[PDB]
Amino acid sequence: MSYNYVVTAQKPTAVNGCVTGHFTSAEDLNLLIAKNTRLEIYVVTAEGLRPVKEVGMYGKIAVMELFRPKGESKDLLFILTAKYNACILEYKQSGESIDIITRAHGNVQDRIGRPSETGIIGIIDPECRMIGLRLYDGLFKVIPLDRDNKELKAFNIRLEELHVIDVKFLYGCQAPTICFVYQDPQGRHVKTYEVSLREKEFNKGPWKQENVEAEASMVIAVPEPFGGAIIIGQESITYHNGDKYLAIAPPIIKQSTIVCHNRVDPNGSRYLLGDMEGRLFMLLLEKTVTLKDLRVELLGETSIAECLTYLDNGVVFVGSRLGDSQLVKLNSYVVAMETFTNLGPIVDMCVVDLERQGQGQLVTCSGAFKEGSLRIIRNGIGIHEHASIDLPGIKGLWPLRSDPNRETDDTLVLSFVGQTRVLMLNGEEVEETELMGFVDDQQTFFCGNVAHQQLIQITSASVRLVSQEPKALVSEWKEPQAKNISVASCNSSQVVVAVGRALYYLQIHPQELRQISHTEMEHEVACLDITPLGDSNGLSPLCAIGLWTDISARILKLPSFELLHKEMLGGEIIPRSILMTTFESSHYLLCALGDGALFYFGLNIETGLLSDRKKVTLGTQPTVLRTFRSLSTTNVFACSDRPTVIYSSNHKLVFSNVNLKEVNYMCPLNSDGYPDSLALANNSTLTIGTIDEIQKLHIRTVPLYESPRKICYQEVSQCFGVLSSRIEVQGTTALRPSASTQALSSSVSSSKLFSEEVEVHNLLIIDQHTFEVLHAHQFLQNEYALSLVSCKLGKDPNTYFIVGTAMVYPEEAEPKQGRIVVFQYSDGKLQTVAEKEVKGAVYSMVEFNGKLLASINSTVRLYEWTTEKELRTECNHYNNIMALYLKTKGDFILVGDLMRSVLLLAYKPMEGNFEEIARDFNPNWMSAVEILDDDNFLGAENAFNLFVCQKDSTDEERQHLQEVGLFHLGEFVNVFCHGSLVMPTQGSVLFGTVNGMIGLVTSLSESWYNLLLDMQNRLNKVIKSVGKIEHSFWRSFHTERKTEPATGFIDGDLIESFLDISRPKMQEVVANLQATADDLIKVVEELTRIH
Amino acid sequence: MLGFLSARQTGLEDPLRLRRAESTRRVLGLELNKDRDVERIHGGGINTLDIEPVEGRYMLSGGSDGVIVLYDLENSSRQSYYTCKAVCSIGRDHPDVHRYSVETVQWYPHDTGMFTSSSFDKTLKVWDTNTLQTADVFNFEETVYSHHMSPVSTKHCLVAVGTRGPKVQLCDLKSGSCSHILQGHRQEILAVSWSPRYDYILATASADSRVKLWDVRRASGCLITLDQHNGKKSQAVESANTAHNGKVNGLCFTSDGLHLLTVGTDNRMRLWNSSNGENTLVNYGKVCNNSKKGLKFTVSCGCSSEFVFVPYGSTIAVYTVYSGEQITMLKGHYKTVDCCVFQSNFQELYSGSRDCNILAWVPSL
User: Matching InterPro entries, A to Z (chain A)?
Assistant: First the structure.
């Protein structure tokens, strides 16, 4: 609402550059990683990468290089922004306090110029004589390192060659000499210039230019011996020193284009190479001393490499924009010792609230090609590991208090296989012990404290009752015929074990175990629970059971074992655990199957009647439950492959994910040294600890090995629709199996309508739980899935997946054909309901008020869904250049255009037509569009900018949209969607970006906006930004045609930074304002509640 | 196009490369937009057009009829087809209307609320767009061929006025001023242009067959004078340092400001280094220029390739600036094309001609 807050929910994960040197100390080996706005420093150690510092830059890092001028203790850092801020950074550490000083800084932007096609290039003379920059066609900027230039004052040199592919300073030259590949009509060539710092002009190169490969894209300068330059083309690799010409054309590299390289040896004997297909390569140079020959070997397969650097001893870092970045060890083959999560380009995403809880969860289409996946981003509660002790095998855990006087848990019992073990756990120290009266030689089904200062241990063999003042054993109950115990359930007084289908009810009395009720069950007992609700006794009137065979949860009258309620759960999957518990006031029955399905019921301590059935699936593995009391209230822990904590708030169940990997069993443990903590055990280890108050994002990956494009969620079908594209090459076939080919069932478009590597397009039906690919529909040859929608249309009750496409032929620049296709997925079958032919590409679609709204090329049109199951066109709006983006609120439509920016178009139900309401008369290239509310409109610029439009308030000129906001995001936004990752500010929008950063936008009242605005400004003065860049510059809306101060946007990243600043530095900022200290602390803290 | 999207989207290529790269694809697909009309007012042929620099919605025209028209080029409709209606006009009745042909009209840069006109009535008039009344008027001893202001900055208020006199005229919009004179041209100055790039550099072209670049801050002398032979030919004075073999009636700077384009009556177009004034020797072939007055032409901007659009006959010749290839000759007009201006926003083009009509040229596909 004209006042907007933007905060980063997830930093960018993509790596645009990596470099390796001695930055932090002359004797440290450093690895530096630039992730967009983010700079990560590391020290390479004996084992692993020690992280040291991470800093934000106000800008997108274009260039990162370390270099060492004569007279410096250690390497210096040179950075160039994409807004062209230049800086020279030093690493300065005083004690454990650690700062990055700006030694020199300036902005090298030219007022105007033609941005070069292959992009910004930073380079540095091997002698640190100058920094070269090729920013624009026609010029070469020189930043002299000769004198002491603290302002980084630079100057251009006219470059006659107007098309330059790549350039590098050459080693070993009496004056800085650049070598470069450039294109003119007659071809591509490699040329050289000396750079006169006195003449401020170029001089003739040391060696004359030579013709090079038509596709030669990449220049490597070779170190002092051999000298010269190596030039990587798509087909061949050539070497030029100026006296000698060496060229090789390996067949092995023809398949891909080589996009990056790293020198391994300092003498330049070995270079790493990498390509768009993921192949790592080794380039070798054989050897008064000169170069004999070149050789290429294929080292392996890593993430598609944006950039790569060798560290030491066979470990290589892989930066990847397109997918997970890697740390990989070399062998013939390559193994990834480490994997760094990157939500790759987030091409699309959607917010789903599964479990029908309060909270959102994000599912993204991420990466591309080999690296494509879905990522599931959700919030969750982490846990603290105080102790983790290796105990493979744990089949169960129980807390026990041994000393009846002590109110603290002193004993952890662990059941194993044919045995039970007992933990002494004195303080923070845990060691194996024995316990009298307890058998170690059987596996333990249940144990704990019980009535009259006694202990009980149930096993496969007997239920053994134990007096704990003397210890030893008082009573024991075995099955009459001495058969084995199937399942165990016991509360402080009562006990029920089941042997097969048979059931025994026991009570606990002084030095006695009293059997009362007995019965045999229709089918075999699966799980039981007797935990008493409402107490008033300590005796439970009811019994909780579930069975094999019929798969039923049943509640029985405990004394009699008569059946109160039997609910039929259905399906081949049998119940793993059943639990009775109370949240708030209300009584639930919880029963969790072996597939992760957890049903929860309304329970009556009287009827035993289960009412209002509900089910959520958390996890795919059998889920076992344990109750644990956390401070005020009782919570149920759920152990599974997606471990979850379940409780109540506002009298409606809440399921919090837990940021752990997998948990087989758990019990709460509070000891004198481990207070109110939890006992968790997985297949390998038994870990101890507590729940982390603060929620951090948890991320899961579903690798597709092909490219996700759109994704959307069909609730009734309990699955996601996803449009994917795999590449095949010339009939065609893939290089690798991907999600589209792994499908359990699959179909191919039969359409009759329309009649060296090609995209093949699939609609994937994907299960919302297993995330397996249920079905794959493959489109026509040369068909493209563009837009995808899940909705029901017209008076027709069926929910459909609707997909717009285009026919992509090589001969044509924009598609003159395409189609809309209605699919329905029900009863595990993908059905094609209908087709609609269209005169071109369907770039976007949105369900509009029970109608379908699609855009085709220049045309935005509305479809109605007939009683005949078809699409009848209602109205066209033809005034557009390219309509790429659609959003809707009510009868309002927001249309994102390629260049014409945005339009609020409306539907007059009366005339059955379209009327333009208002337009943005500022031309902008749109990435995304969102409607904030009936008035304000959010939009994303091609240039990494955000803006906001608003319906104005007299003449017929009310058709003019005012711009009430402008902000430079620094990220390219692919998708906007309403929703939040949680549960002062109205509204919440999330956005996915190319670098993987996830943002959130929300609205503020003017009173707030202004407060934060001042706070921003005072904060700015006090905070020392890295490159000495100006924050207000950083955020200033900027393009070719415009540069303006950000307005109507508060930078959350900047504001949330106020909590980390020095206590005094805080009081400095506060000062006068418009308010004191802890007041702002309070505010800024609340503002973090939003993500 | 689908590739443009999917690339930009997976961030394969830089979003503003694909953007430039598309933009050029469009210029290439340029054709006469028969779906867009411009409302006819001018009774005399259209001598000049200028599209508002920021956001480019409104455009100024001027006629041999001495009228100035102001159009809104935007479309409010449900439809793709529309006319560009004239918002305002300086007409036969307007007290301050020009008496003779209006040769140039230019938006005061950096302030939309004011535009400027020069005429053959020997005046330069400074207008005010809201009030549509005069603001400043300047008079000259001779007819005004070309005027211009610096697109680069607010560091100064100077206008450069080309007149029949051999002296180049610098009028200062701040106060009345204009005692500032550039000397050394021997004939009519038929064109004047400020560098897009440098604040104080101006380029002047004269019937004296010469082109000079000045730093106006200097009391005496120019910076360079364009010699078409790069001085490989030894001439007596009065001969040497000529741009063309005829009147030089056109001037344009390439978008970056690093080169100059001149059109002569010698039927040639030459591209020059804007710094040292060397001839780059780009071909272009024969380009017909017979005009006795000045010749307005323009350059593309914001695309991979830079194009120049120069009126050629009743057509508009499109060339590539650096390469020197003729792309196409845009044909809509039935009589001689006097000027054309480029719409930077959408890659469209607008042309004025002696048929008293303004044609719209938009890219197709």
Answer: Beta-prop_RSE1/DDB1/CPSF1_1st, Cleavage/polyA-sp_fac_asu_C, RSE1/DDB1/CFT1/CPSF1, WD40/YVTN_repeat-like_dom_sf, WD40_repeat_dom_sf
Q: In what order do the strands lie in the sheet with B211-215?
A: B189-194, B201-206, B211-215, B224-225
Q: How far apart are CA B355 and CA B42, in angstroms?
A: 10
The H-or-E segment that residue B171 falls in is strand B168-172
Domain span including residue A733 = 1-14+343-379+697-1003
Tell whether A721 and A653 lie within a shared domain.
Answer: no
Both A648 and A708 in one domain: the answer is: no
Q: How far apart are the first and last CA of chain B?
A: 10
Q: A583, A582, A581: which is closest to A649 by C-alpha?
A: A583
- DSSP letter string, A1028-1052: S--HHHHTSEE-SS-EE--BSEEEH
Return d(Cα A352, Cα A344) in angstroms, integer: 20
Closest CA to A996 of A32, A35, A5: A35
Residues A687, A619 within the same domain? yes
Q: Do residues A417 and A499 share a domain?
A: yes
User: How far, CA to CA in Å, does A311 sit from each of A19, A45, A263, A285, A318?
Assistant: 9, 10, 11, 20, 10
HSE value, Cβ hemisphere, 13 Å, CA-based, for A368: 25
**Tokens encoding A1040:** 């070719």
Region label for A721, one of left (φ > 0), alpha (ψ between -120 and 50) or beta (otherwise): beta
Does A438 share its domain with A369? Answer: no
Q: Which tokens sit at A14? A: 């993509």
Instruction: State both tokens at A310.
Output: 């060798």
Cα of first residue to Cα of last residue in chain A, in angstroms, is 19
Contact in structure between B344 and B24 (CB atoms under 8 Å): no
Closest CA to A1074 of A1003, A1007, A1005: A1007
Among candidate residues A652, A671, A696, the one where a domain is terminated: A696
CA max distance for chain A: 107
Residues in CB range of A957: below 8 A, 6 or more apart: none
User: With an 8 Å Cβ cutoff, is B11 touching chain A?
Assistant: yes
The DSSP string of B303-346 is SSS-EEEEEETTEEEEEETTT--EEEEE---SS-EEEEEEETTT
Residues A906 and A917 in one domain: yes
A483 and A374, same structural domain?
Answer: no
Stated as kind and residue range, the H or E segment containing B6 is: helix B2-10
CA–CA distance, A144 with A152 (Å, rounded to integer): 8
Using CB atoms, which residue from B11, B55, B78 is nearest to A994?
Answer: B11
Three-point CA angle B26, B32, B38, nearest 5°: 115
- Alpha-carbon distance A642 to nearest alpha carbon in chain B (angstroms): 30
- Among candidate residues A997, A994, A883, the one with its CA nearest the CA of residue A943: A994
> Do A893 and A810 belong to one domain?
yes
Question: Around Cβ A491, how many Cβ atoms within 10 Å?
Answer: 18
Method in brief? X-ray
3-class secondary-structure state, position A384 = strand
A913 touches chain B (CB under 8 A): yes
**A 123-182 residues with CB < 8 A to B:** 136-139, 158, 162
A 783-842 → B contacts, CB under 8 A: 784, 786, 806, 808, 813-815, 841
CATH number, residue A1085: 1.10.150.910
Cβ–Cβ contact A104 with B under 8 A:
no
The residue assigned the tokens 């390998």 is A684
Own/partner pairs for B111-120, CB < 8 Å, 24+ apart?
Answer: B112/B52, B112/B54, B115/B50, B115/B60, B115/B70, B116/B147, B116/B149, B116/B159, B117/B62, B117/B68, B117/B90, B118/B144, B118/B146, B118/B147, B118/B161, B119/B66, B119/B143, B119/B144, B120/B144
DSSP A531-597: --SS-SSS--SEEEEEESTT-EEEEEETTTTEEEEEEE--SSPPEEEEEEEESSS-EEEEEEETTSE
Indicate the resolution in Å: 3.3
Give residue A672's identity as a one-letter amino acid code.
Answer: D
CATH code of domain B1-365: 2.130.10.10
